[PDB]
């Protein structure tokens, strides 16, 4: 659904905590307005995983929806003595940041959100490793997503889950083995997933499955004024209670009572939504987030 991709799940907040000048169009992201922290993900040719799960949450959305927590320092200062907490973790990542960006966020190895930031008139370099002075007219108001990922809510416990990769000694900042032969190093696009009580879990394989449903989270409701989001909680179910009156597709009318003259809004079933599960070492689990990132991998020969 092309324009309904801006009808976000949850609150739809796509702002970073320290940059609130875009709140009019990022808090929340909806049909109207532009958002420097969100529109990046919908450019065709970029972020293929999120674009195939676009009705799920972004990293910023998962943070403001209490699904993902912030790092103990929520943002690292590149132009300091060290920029330490993110520096060692950012250098193993091969990233590309567009111009005029003051902040860039990523999923930590701890399953939390870290941010890389710069002074008010610096741009992030093309590798997101240094702060370069601004050669635009003005900076963007938001933060650039470094990884291609989507997120969801989950109570499935993954405290027993850990990275298992064939013949891999070091992937990113994770050392899996003691390798004393001399090794093969390369930048590999490695999938990963975060679980409730786990760290980041890299995988040889991305095996995902979706169970679609007719729960309220799988619907996009909207009204014409010119599109405006509508919350399905105001719609009465079949034999139910409603503060407003709605209509919709055959999927919505199968569970909610439909009225195709009076309607305040229209609800469509967001195809592609639902609960996503991933296979980790031969076991299906409900992850908090799933994504890719190009990072340094050392494999034994």
């Amino acid at each position: 659904e092309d324009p309904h991709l801006r009808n976000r799940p949850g609150k739809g907040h796509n702002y970073i905590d320290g940059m609130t000048q875009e709140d009019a169009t990022c808090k929340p992201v909806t049909y109207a307005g532009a958002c420097s922290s969100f529109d990046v993900l919908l450019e065709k040719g970029k972020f293929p995983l999120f674009q195939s799960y676009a009705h799920h949450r972004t990293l910023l959305e998962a943070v403001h929806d209490t699904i993902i927590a912030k790092a103990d320092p929520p943002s690292c200062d590149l132009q300091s003595a060290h920029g330490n907490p993110c520096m060692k973790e950012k250098l193993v990542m091969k990233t590309h940041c567009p111009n005029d960006y003051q902040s860039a966020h990523y999923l930590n190895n701890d399953g939390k959100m870290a941010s890389v930031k710069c002074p008010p008139k610096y741009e992030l370099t093309e590798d997101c490793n240094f702060c370069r002075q601004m050669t635009g007219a003005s900076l963007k108001k938001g933060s650039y997503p470094l990884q291609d990922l989507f997120c969801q809510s989950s109570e499935d416990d993954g405290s027993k889950l850990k990275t298992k990769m064939k013949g891999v000694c070091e992937v990113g900042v994770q050392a899996l083995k003691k390798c004393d032969g001399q090794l093969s190093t390369a930048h590999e696009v490695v999938p990963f997933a975060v679980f409730k009580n786990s760290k980041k879990v890299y995988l040889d394989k991305l095996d995902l499955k979706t169970e679609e449903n007719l729960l309220p989270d799988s619907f996009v409701c909207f009204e014409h004024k010119e599109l405006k989001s509508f919350d399905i909680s105001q719609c009465p179910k079949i034999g139910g209670h409603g503060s407003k009156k709605c209509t919709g597709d055959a999927a919505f009318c199968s569970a909610y009572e439909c009225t195709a003259q009076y309607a305040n809004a229209y609800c469509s079933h967001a195809n592609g939504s639902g609960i996503v599960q991933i296979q980790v070492s031969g076991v299906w689990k409900k992850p908090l987030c799933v994504g890719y990132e190009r990072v340094v991998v050392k494999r034994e020969l």
Partner: antibody
Amino acid sequence: QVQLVQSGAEVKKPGASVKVSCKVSGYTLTELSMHWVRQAPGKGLEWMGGFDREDGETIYAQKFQGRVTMTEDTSTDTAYMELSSLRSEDTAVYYCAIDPIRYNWNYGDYWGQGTLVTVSS
Amino acid sequence: PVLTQPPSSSASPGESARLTCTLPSDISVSSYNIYWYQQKPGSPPRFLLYYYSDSDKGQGSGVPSRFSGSKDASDNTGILLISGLQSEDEADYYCMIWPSNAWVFGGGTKLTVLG
């Protein structure tokens, strides 16, 4: 088009509380983030607090923290602002206000007409 | 953060008035949207326009294009420019920035169109 109407002028003894209203018409209150700004006579504007509806959290300024309380009546589209432990320096015109950037579609009111509150015994 | 505006400013009719809004040294004008309000006695403040950049800016409803905004990075100032000054423009003018959970207003500037 939004219409913001505040209650009438007030006189309160020092130490008591004052309660100001802002009635919203032409728009639904539960889609607006209402703020409050006061202005002592002949002086500048001062932000007192606001309610973030996207967050559902009420924020206050520290100069008033403990004294200013913000409620609402969704059935009447009316927001309320309560200031306690009134002192002589609290004499001001109290405005209910709306973010002009987020609500650039509105061609009606962004501020209330104002409510004068005099503190005297 | 304190926003300092000159207490008063004056210009002749037909000329251009330039009102400044200087920010402290620990924050930058380049980071924030800059609100500008016009307030006349007996009435609430009226939103003039906001300026962040030449591509991120907006004008208030019913506000003539004589009112425009800009920034000066070297002086760390937000600027409200009123071209073709007319008699009805004599009022108080406030600037506002929204960096965190607070509306921070400048001291206000009494602009007198020099009768």
